[model samples]
Target: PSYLKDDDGRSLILRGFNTASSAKSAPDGMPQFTEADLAREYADMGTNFVRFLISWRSVEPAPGVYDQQYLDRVEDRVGWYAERGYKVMLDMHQDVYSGAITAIGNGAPAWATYMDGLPVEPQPRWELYYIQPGVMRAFDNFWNTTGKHPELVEHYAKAWRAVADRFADNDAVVAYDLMNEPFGGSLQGPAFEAGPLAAMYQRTTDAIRQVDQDTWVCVAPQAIGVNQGLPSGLTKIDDPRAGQQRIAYCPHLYPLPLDHEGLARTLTDVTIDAWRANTAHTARVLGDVPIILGEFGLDTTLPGARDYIERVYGTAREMGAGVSYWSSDPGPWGPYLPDGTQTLLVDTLNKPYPRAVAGTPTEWSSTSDRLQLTIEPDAAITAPTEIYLPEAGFPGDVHVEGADVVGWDRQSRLLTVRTPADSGNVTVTVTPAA
Candidate 1:
């Protein structure tokens, strides 16, 4: 089955967070968490999907060579999630090019670095690398395959092919995020989409298929306007199977200015109403495929930051989209603070969501005390619809309305509802236990 499906081919509504300390230059891969500890945490919160970050440097420390040990480390962590029923997507994450370019990121080895002897200087914000002459120069070389390199993208694809070959049979590894925030450098408009970016994805997807054809191939657009649900500026992939069933148009949303100031603090332009409008527009632009919110979350220390979490997630739920919250390491920038204080955002972040719907889900929403779902049953699928309700949010005195509760697992926190053969609409509501 695809990444967005249960083993029985039931389309899934995957929900969870990302383990991406590596993006922030963590040495031991993920943050300090034991396999058992991490597994328990995710399961207890009813999270079934994990967007795990695996750096390109870790996979290929040297050119044309595979690092088995590094891969083993990744496999071991992936196993932890699988053991506890969490599906995983290995994110080949990068920021501002490579450590060679900034010594602050985790993608592309030094051997792949081609700065064209351009000067490298520090900037105020890390993202300025996108505009930096040196960084853009390297991105130009990598995307265009023109500077002092022998098919740079080809080597990258081979590296992905190698990774896929290593874990081709791992059921827990459901997808491979092709690249993180692919910067087009000087190339913009149709030039970037038609030229380098689209070709890069096609090449990468082709290579991944060569080794692991079963897993979902995730592609992202240029980072600009991603937060606003703007059109991805990406064209179709060359692969025939690359659509609603196989490929995913993963986009990251941050909704600028709203991020810098907490939603509660700003309280001006960032409203869930705007979110509904923006996301719907983007979804229409995305067309009939999955609208996965590949990444969204911010430091909760800012006042009213929790409101941002609610708005983003509410927006995601409204769009029938799955989201991977940003960062898991113990830092002020994520769910955990360095001082060991957990942020209030986790409560909303880990709220109940439909894990797998038997039919096309028409309506789903959750509140502090109530969770409601309405699905239009598919006349064919007999499998029960699954909803994950975390103990933190599910009330014991649950009320079922238009659907029959079929399977209930309090231990796993999964509630399965059966839609009648001729059922037009099925609704299930759960009130929180106060």
Candidate 2:
């Protein structure tokens, strides 16, 4: 009974919180919360799913040794959320293979962090993959792992499958996201074009399917800029489980590509073109496999940030794709969160209701020989509403918001409307004054 396709058979559009703290600690790492805390999450805000995280380092500190105690803790947490009717996606998420690559990460357990042999050094230019540990000895180990243990990826999967074997039968834990974001993928040469990630998912997906016959397999591609194009013919759901759906082709979407300077370019025509090129390029190579923006988002506080996100979401919607906001805790030196996770990811998803603003377009007549707005509302009422106003809709002193003259900026050929501050019922009436 996947949240995607439950008893009645409807696509699952889940909204909920990601328990990241637990991701850092042992199986029971999730800080103890009172029933009131749970009640608030369940009652006050409707949370349908919890991206349940299970740690390999904590669960199997040493190879072949799984702390049943920790597993039980994870089990209890699943039971807790399940009792609340919240579906779970047991995330075997990791960054930089093991602690060897990430100075701060302990997700891969000591035993599993086996480096075969290779000459390498810490990435001196480590700009913080998750904004944690300015590149240290992690790459050295990764280089070593790549050399002797190309199958270390498979080995990691085997370990995860062992865990899945333990929890596979349980209907509550929905699926397994094989890997987080695999970086340093080679353009060519080596055994994989997309670097080691292609190997990682193949093994992990194979291993997980051996145990869980029901859970879906969620995979991620390089959270990278695809200059050459998405690595050809690589995916996770290649061998999907029964009743399991291939939900997405995971790719983190950043509205704008960053330059040497910290300033984020306004996501405008140029930005959209670059974005579209990347998307089209990736799609061209990946074929029909779905892409999920596994880790993508920008601080909405930045200029043009909201518009950029809206565009990406709108494009994804039109393409009939699935998406999830990246998790909280931005990473080390991470802002806001004590642990530095992507705080906004949590704030946005766990919101109470929809945030949309409906109003008239700048004009009513003469736009592109025709102008129309079709909003096929999915269960994603929490997302902001967007009504595209074509060039024709703007001629007559465009009242951007279509009301209250919220000040017009004709340069962008766009109207700005305030989204509903609160999460609840919202209706946007569209009328064209032109």
Candidate 3:
């Protein structure tokens, strides 16, 4: 299917962690979590999706060139995820335009990068590159195609088409994130999205569809603030090519001081409301299009980081959306510490969510306190609802309502519930067993 769904046609929710070592730095691929570790740590917690990282630099080192070796490495990781019943989204990640900006950044093979002889000085922080004249000029050139390469966008589209051709028949590889954190030189706000960004997306979509139509092609807004909501001056995506309606909006959200554990409970209500509104607005922009928080969360070492995860996860459920956490850093940011103890985020984000709902899920939430899910039952649905319940979250006891339990897996901690055909509003509640 174009979008995620279970065997019975229920919409499937994606909940998983992102594997890192961005593509630019590791074209051959970086060390992945061991298959055994992922099964015990991630799959056991109900993770069914992954925003797998890939790189344009690795895929196309030069014009019209493809690297079978790099893609084969990606295939290994995808296999690991698929074997665990996880879906994968190939994320073409880029930071600071390209490695040309800094030896550390990723994305864009050197041939595609046109610096115009601008001074390419490295900034202390990776994000500072966005403000650099050299980086800005490079971005402007790509957007305007003013110099060097007249086929910059066309080349990118071709690269994607080649990629799509490789996995068009693979169902486990569900989607492609066209470009991560796309930026537009000095262009900001409405003009950027409604103009250059939309055009590039349309072109890329058309290119990919020409070769393969099965995979979902995703695009993201600029990586500024919480761009979940369409910019105030934005317009509908123009020249939407074939399968354009199927393009999913993948957005990243980061609230400042996102990892502060000490300030978790202290975050103001106004702050919470604003954050929630931003993402909710983004989800509704394309009508019934799927909304995936392609990236969220921050360094795990920050105080109250766990609280931040709880709030964001809760908000995602309210919008009936899914999430792919920012990364799996082994340091303070990763779910597990160096000593192998799971961080607070693991417990907070690993709670129950509707894995598969018989109909459109109106709402769903899981925190330390309880798990609640509500769906607008579709009379046509013949499949049962599937909710993931971790034993740690339900150690004391288990209770459910608004549906009947048809099956339970203690090992996998999954619950299958049959909803009444006449049930207009189906609700499922799971509280702490204790």
Candidate 4:
């Protein structure tokens, strides 16, 4: 399994929330999340990464006109994360095309939406809206399936270029998730993925490379069938960068029957296995790129939800994939409820884990009070391996084996350790002092 690396050459084990679903409808395009909210989150979960949401409608409010103010606002939020030592992946998120199709939908600007007089009737569920004539036509026009809007994609590419130019030198910003959940209107499966979808990614990657050559460019397969344990037909994307490819695979998982226990849970379990297999296959196809589980979550109140969450995280750990839970919004599905009460998710996500490994991690496991990590030492990396130990488990000092402790900051709940540079493969273990 491949891993995304930091500037210091440490392999990053990213874990955090989507930062929000609220931004989809905000007039200012910023999430309701504040620095205080972020502080509370870190204090509770020790998360070191976030899949921050951004929107094309916000970035490019009009054709050939970019919004520096919006970018500035985004930079300010990125600043909050940077100050707290978090890596940010800017996700250009969208759902069901754009708000132009329906108030419930979001992504592109109204100017870019062309439904061709198609009607979009009300649907019982939001997902059903995707098949609506107006929505389908909107996506068709954007992908140029209708052959009437070749320039739309050009503008989309440039919009990303504009964003890249601004964030080119930002250290905390590590990646740009090219699109949220790509949907093919008239095109489906390989016909869409290997064709227009790949073309858009290639174009956007080229455009982004024009200004930012270092930030990883992450791509996702279409959302519909691929999100439900189906194979993705997404093809390989070339990196124009001079050295190793920075392309990463970012995919979401949503097995249908995850909301219940018993029979439903059984079905969901099977779906998860299939999803993991398919995800692994896709990653290999994409040149064994690093994988990030971009979104996955269930109602904390749902039966067997804890087990499902743990199972998904375990799969991600085995695959060396990063995770950003579906959202940070305030609700039952989030870490906290609307009135500021903690949810089961907080405790579930607060376990000990390695944040960054100075070398390639081969295997790792952790509990509330203990953690074990095996890595193939990389002599070239000068940084120490970093891990997050929750205070609930390690209130005082920690005992270590197979490595020397560098330092431990209780306030931040981080421990730094080092091993012999020439160690072939080292297994480091940490537990509360006996």
Top candidate (TM-score): 4
**Alpha-carbon TM-score of each model against the true structure:** 0.88, 0.61, 0.88, 0.99
Give the Cα-based TM-score of candidate 1 against the true structure.
Answer: 0.88
lDDT of 2: 0.47
Candidate 1 lDDT over 149-254, as tens digits, reads 5478888888898899988899888778888877777786557865778888888888888877678777777776545544456776654444444666677876
What total of clashing residue pairs does each candidate reach? 0, 26, 10, 0
Instruction: Candidate 1: give its CA RMSD in angstroms.
Output: 3.3
> How accurate locally, in lDDT, is each candidate?
0.71, 0.47, 0.71, 0.94
- Regions of candidate 1 where Cα sits further than 4 Å from its true position: 1-3, 23-31, 145-150, 228-230, 240-245, 259-287, 393-397, 431-434
Report the Cα lDDT for residue 121, model 4.
95
Residue pairs with colliding backbones in model 1 are none
CA lDDT, candidate 3, residue 12: 77
Candidate 3 residue 80 Cα shift, in angstroms, is: 1.3
| Model 1 per-residue lDDT at 422 | 80
> Taking the tens digit of each residue's C-alpha lDDT, what string does model 3 give over 317-358?
666566888776566676777777777667666777777788
C-alpha lDDT of candidate 3 relative to the true structure: 0.71
Model 2 alpha-carbon drift over 4 Å, by segment: 1-4, 25-45, 100-103, 114-147, 184-196, 226-237, 240-247, 255-291, 300-312, 328-434
lDDT digits (tens) for residues 1-434 of candidate 4: 99999999999999999988999989999999999999999999999999999999999999999999999999999999999999999999999989999678998999999999999999899988999999899999999999999999999999999999999999999999999999999899999999999999999999999999999999999988889899999999999999999999999999887625788888888898998999999999989999999999988998788999999999999999999999899998999999989999999999999999999999999999999999999999989999999999999999999999999999999999998878599999999997
| Model 3 TM-score on a 0 to 1 scale | 0.88
Model 4 lDDT, full chain set: 0.94
